[PDB]
Design a binder for these strands. Structure first.
Ligand SMILES: [Mg+2]
Ligand SMILES: [Mg+2]
Ligand SMILES: [Mg+2]
Ligand SMILES: [Mg+2]
Ligand SMILES: [Mg+2]
Ligand SMILES: [Mg+2]
Ligand SMILES: [Mg+2]
Ligand SMILES: [Mg+2]
Ligand SMILES: [Mg+2]
Ligand SMILES: [Mg+2]
Ligand SMILES: [Mg+2]
Ligand SMILES: [Mg+2]
Ligand SMILES: [Mg+2]
Ligand SMILES: [Mg+2]
Ligand SMILES: [Mg+2]
Ligand SMILES: [Mg+2]
Lengths: 179, 184, 234, 173, 91
RNA sequence: GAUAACUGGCUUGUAGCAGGCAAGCGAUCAUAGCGACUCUGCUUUUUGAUUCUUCGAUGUCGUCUCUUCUGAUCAUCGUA
RNA sequence: AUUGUAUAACUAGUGGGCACAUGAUUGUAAGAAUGAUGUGCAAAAAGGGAUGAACCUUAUGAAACAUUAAAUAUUCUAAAUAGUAGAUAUUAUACCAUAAAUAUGAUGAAUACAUGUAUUAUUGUAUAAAAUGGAAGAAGAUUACUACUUUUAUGAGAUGUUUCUAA
């Protein structure tokens, strides 16, 4: 975070692999184990999100559950930009909807945060309302959007319109060039 | 919203064009025009006998302006090479109309329109003139170097010489444009 | 509730507030436009009101008529020129440049500038040199756009008025050229001009004066308000 | 430590420039403004007429002499903007307003003196590019400014014309 | 000057520009990927940078080779240098 | 003023002024001009419902004189 | 969890109440009338909502120094015009000081079909009329408006550290 003003390479959301089961009893010792991956900020926030998902597909109350083990997954980044396509379900005022987007980033932790920036304008909802199904790396000839297909072509050159001042002072004399 | 947009305009050899920063100057045989292009947020480069206009990262409301400013500057090239000519012929019913020209084609005077006593005056715009035509005996031709001065003046006569307060589907008296050709 | 019937208001709001004027000879606020093609001529005069009679005249329309009209008479002796000013155009507006007077000034203007003991103050003062006036007329010719002259009247030729203070005024000069206007006005120092030079017959004028006085008045004579009924108290 | 500063007001936003000056006065400096008829007001020309037309409606109904005054000149209009930032009623604000002076165009005294600009208020570096705007003195012609033509001529001509050592080191040591 | 792979960049302010970086890849119209001198990869918008006039070729290089192309006076010594220009204006 | 007759305040049943949809009239043609059965509003200009302020006092109806303000414009001005 | 618990004797004031949150009965409706559970004002300080009996932080002797809460950081006014993007309409308030049925536009949004026709989500304008000269608190703002994240700082008899007074 030297040049930028916010951390865009390591966002607050991370990736956690979770697993849990039921507490043993007399009628049923050694019950079934489950596993998943949820994206959150700590393991405590990821514990609360995962236990609610287990309430809906099965009748397992979270008061009877026990957390087995949760570890974090990091990726050895090289630095090449890749293509990603995210499918998700978001909650709005009228009901639930499901959509699909395509992005371009360095890693799937970073490509998730580019979705939250776009969703702040087009959808206008809190970040806890989007449920992410899967993130996958897209190869060529699966790109369904012209925006990714325009930037994927090699040897790009385009200039920049200059509009930023190079001095953090109150006043300068007239004819000093802010280049 | 595409990345790069581009337009090209081919100039002739007799029309000379030179440009300073965001301002154009056209000099040819049949007159002179100057054009100000500083208001638009675009790039202007003069190549070998052609004008190139480029524009990066525009939206849909900005793409449509690239064609319009092209066709506006395209008209000013041919206008200095060839002047314009607009022929307007007056139609009448039971009354007659007289055309009077004063101070070398700057003032057009219209009399006896539907038998009214007060005559009408019309001034001409910048860089334009009016002449009579003795051959076709019922029309005049507005000839000028520049197009928007000519096309504005012909519209001024048509709107000001219509009849109001009466049924316009029956009376049918006015001045109407016949053809729009160049001077040569 | 609303007013029952409609009626216009009494009096004019263009003249509110009503106060007495500060002087007996008011200045002129506006002067007509100048054209550089026409000749050099003055624009004003100073007179004294005398009386009122009537004349008759004819008008044809064919047969003639007899119309009876009432006229008024203004007695005007000559006026003398004794100074030249100049104004320039700035960003704020008009600003004065200089003022050049003639050499010998009449004692009538000395009575106007210095009220009592005018013999004491005028004897002590002294005039400008040659070199001071040659700088001022040069700086008038280079910077000015509006040139006006100074004119004083001659009330001592009418002994009925019992007046020896003479009224002064400023009169614009509308003429051809700015440099030509100053050279015309320097020639006319201490020389008079009559009323016949400026106005001819059939030329509409403007008149500037002060009305008669009537003192502390009521409401009816001031504005035009309808009286009350007879039955009313107070 | 208190400085005297001459400011060129051109190519500046009108409201944002008056914000930074009002803090610069409340620390006890002296400042002068030149060319106040060339400040910028954002938005279309059509809204900016509708805003000023609502300001010309407020007048006292009982006695209109003791009412809100409407100044026309671009110097005296710019002073009304800076007065809204300053507590002009108490003794603290009465002193800071005695160090302020604005002018129309460029007068004769300041041809050789330098000028400064504010980089937090210039239009190229404040806002997004490509929106409509208008000048200040362009607006006040329609409300009755008598002289906008002579100031343009005199300032532009001003803005056109400006566009034995080794022995002494050995001896003194 | 343009945006391309290998363009040298610097911070925007005229002070505090001591460290440089090289663009690795292009994300969008306003986002770029850099390589620092330490070796971490940072994602940063265009509006924090200024461009320099030098282009390198990085089509085939490894990680460490791009890091290759990236790369006190006291009060008494400031008494002499003031003295030297002091006499040059006195003459 | 723990409690009415008058002014003020919250409300709009009643009063006044507009809207949406279109069965039909208009010689055939829903919308030149009108519009049934139903549905949604605004204003404080009638009349009600309540009793927050005044009972050691705020002078009632109508008329006469005079000033100013609102648009939901009767003429006068410009368009369709 | 509580070092006390239990029992007697004598005596005053009060018996016109109101408000917020949750849920009800009558009434077209009301700052209307009448009940149910909890907490307040009455009888309660300081800080914030521009201003306000009841809203939000919060327990109490006289002072000094550091840390926060509620709320804010262009200027009045102590405290970074510290970031991504959209809005053209003189846009912008938790209680709180109003807006509807209805008709149509726009996105490098999504799905179905043949560059365009259908729906869905987000969003703009019309509908929108009053009595002295006007209220986002004001000047003014289009990067001082709206939506979503991370840091820094300012800021209460609150909470910590030291001195002193009360059975
Ligand atoms: Mg008609
Ligand atoms: Mg009279
Ligand atoms: Mg009596
Ligand atoms: Mg009562
Ligand atoms: Mg009364
Ligand atoms: Mg009704
Ligand atoms: Mg009374
Ligand atoms: Mg009384
Ligand atoms: Mg109307
Ligand atoms: Mg009590
Ligand atoms: Mg309090
Ligand atoms: Mg408030
Ligand atoms: Mg401050
Ligand atoms: Mg602090
Ligand atoms: Mg305490
Ligand atoms: Mg404390």
């Amino acid at each position: 975070m030297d040049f930028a003003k916010r951390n865009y390479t390591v966002p607050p959301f991370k990736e956690y692999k979770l697993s849990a089961c039921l507490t043993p009893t007399s009628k049923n010792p050694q019950p079934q184990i489950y596993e998943s991956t949820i994206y959150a900020q700590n393991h405590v926030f990821a514990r609360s999100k995962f236990f609610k998902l287990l309430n809906d597909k099965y009748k397992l109350k979270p008061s009877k559950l026990v957390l087995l083990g949760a570890e974090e997954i990091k990726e050895q980044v090289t630095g090449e930009v890749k293509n990603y396509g995210i499918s998700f379900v978001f909650r709005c005022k009228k009901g639930l909807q499901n959509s699909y987007r395509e992005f371009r980033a360095i890693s799937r932790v970073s490509a998730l945060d580019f979705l939250f920036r776009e969703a702040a304008i087009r959808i206008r909802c809190k970040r806890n309302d989007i449920f992410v199904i899967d993130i996958k790396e897209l190869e060529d000839e699966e790109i369904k959007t012209g925006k990714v297909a325009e930037f994927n072509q090699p040897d790009l050159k385009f200039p920049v319109f200059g509009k930023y001042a190079n001095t953090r002072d109150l006043y300068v004399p007239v004819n000093t060039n802010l280049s | 919203t595409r990345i790069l947009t581009e337009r090209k305009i081919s100039i002739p050899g007799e029309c000379q064009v030179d440009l300073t920063k965001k301002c154009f100057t056209f000099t040819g045989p049949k007159g002179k025009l100057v054009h100000d292009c500083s208001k638009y947020l675009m790039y202007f480069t003069v190549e070998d006998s052609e004008i190139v206009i480029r524009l990066w990262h525009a939206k849909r409301k900005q793409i449509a302006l690239a064609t319009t400013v092209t066709s506006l500057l395209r008209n000013s090239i041919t206008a200095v090479t060839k002047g314009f000519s607009y022929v307007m012929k007056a139609v009448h019913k039971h009354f007659s109309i007289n055309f009077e020209i004063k101070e070398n084609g700057k003032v057009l005077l219209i009399k006896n329109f539907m038998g009214e006593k007060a005559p009408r005056e019309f001034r001409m715009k910048g860089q334009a003139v009016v002449k009579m035509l003795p051959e076709r005996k019922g029309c005049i031709s507005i000839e000028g170097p520049s197009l928007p001065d000519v096309s504005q003046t012909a519209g001024d006569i048509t709107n000001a010489c219509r009849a109001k307060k009466l049924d316009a589907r029956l009376f049918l008296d006015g001045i109407y444009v016949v053809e729009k050709t160049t001077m040569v | 509730s609303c007013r029952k019937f409609n009626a216009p208001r009494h009096g004019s709001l263009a003249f509110c507030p009503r106060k007495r004027s500060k002087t007996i000879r008011p200045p002129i606020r506006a002067f007509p436009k100048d054209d550089p093609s026409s000749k050099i001529h003055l624009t004003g005069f100073i007179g004294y009101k005398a009386g009122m009679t009537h004349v008759v005249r004819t008008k044809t329309v064919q047969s003639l008529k007899e119309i009876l009209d009432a006229v008024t008479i203004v007695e005007t002796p000559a006026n003398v020129i004794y100074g030249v000013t100049g104004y320039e155009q700035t960003g704020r507006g008009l600003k004065r440049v200089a003022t050049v007077f003639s050499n010998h000034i009449d004692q009538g203007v000395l009575r106007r500038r210095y009220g009592l003991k005018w013999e004491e103050i005028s004897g002590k003062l002294s005039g400008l040199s040659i070199e001071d006036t040659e700088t001022k007329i040069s700086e008038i010719k280079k910077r000015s756009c509006v040139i006006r002259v100074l004119v004083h009247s001659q009330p001592s030729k009418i002994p009925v008025l019992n007046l020896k203070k003479s009224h002064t005024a400023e009169i614009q000069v509308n003429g051809g050229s700015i440099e030509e206007k100053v050279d015309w006005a320097l020639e006319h120092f201490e020389k008079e001009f009559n009323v016949q030079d400026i106005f001819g017959v059939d030329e509409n004028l403007d008149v500037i004066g002060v009305t008669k006085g009537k003192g502390f008045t009521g409401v009816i004579k001031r504005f035009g308000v309808t009286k009350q009924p007879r039955k009313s108290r107070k | 430590m208190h400085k005297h500063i001459v400011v060129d007001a051109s190519n500046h936003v009108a409201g944002k420039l008056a914000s930074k000056i009002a803090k610069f006065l409340l620390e006890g400096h002296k400042v002068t403004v030149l060319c106040t008829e060339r400040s910028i007001l954002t938005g279309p020309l059509d809204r900016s007429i509708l805003k000023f037309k609502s300001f010309m409606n407020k007048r006292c109904r009982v006695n209109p002499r003791k009412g809100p005054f409407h100044h026309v000149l671009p110097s005296m209009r710019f002073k009304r903007i800076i007065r809204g930032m300053i507590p002009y009623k108490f003794h603290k604000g009465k002193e800071a307003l005695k160090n302020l002076e604005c002018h129309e165009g460029i007068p004769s005294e300041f041809i050789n003196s330098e000028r400064v600009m504010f980089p937090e208020c210039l239009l190229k570096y404040c806002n997004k590019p490509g929106k409509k705007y208008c000048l200040l003195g362009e607006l006040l012609v329609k409300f009755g400014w008598k002289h906008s033509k002579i100031v343009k001529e005199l300032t532009d001509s001003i803005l056109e014309k400006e566009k034995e050592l080794e022995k002494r080191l050995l001896s003194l040591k | 000057k343009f945006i391309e792979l290998g363009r040298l960049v610097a911070p925007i302010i005229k002070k505090e520009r001591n460290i440089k970086a090289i663009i690795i890849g292009i994300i969008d119209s306003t986002f770029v990927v850099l390589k620092k001198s330490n070796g971490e990869n940072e994602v940063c918008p265009v509006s924090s940078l200024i461009l320099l006039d030098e282009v390198y070729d990085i089509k085939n290089l490894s990680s460490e080779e791009i890091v290759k192309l990236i790369e006190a006076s006291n009060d008494f010594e400031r008494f002499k240098n003031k003295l030297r220009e002091e006499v040059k204006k006195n003459i």
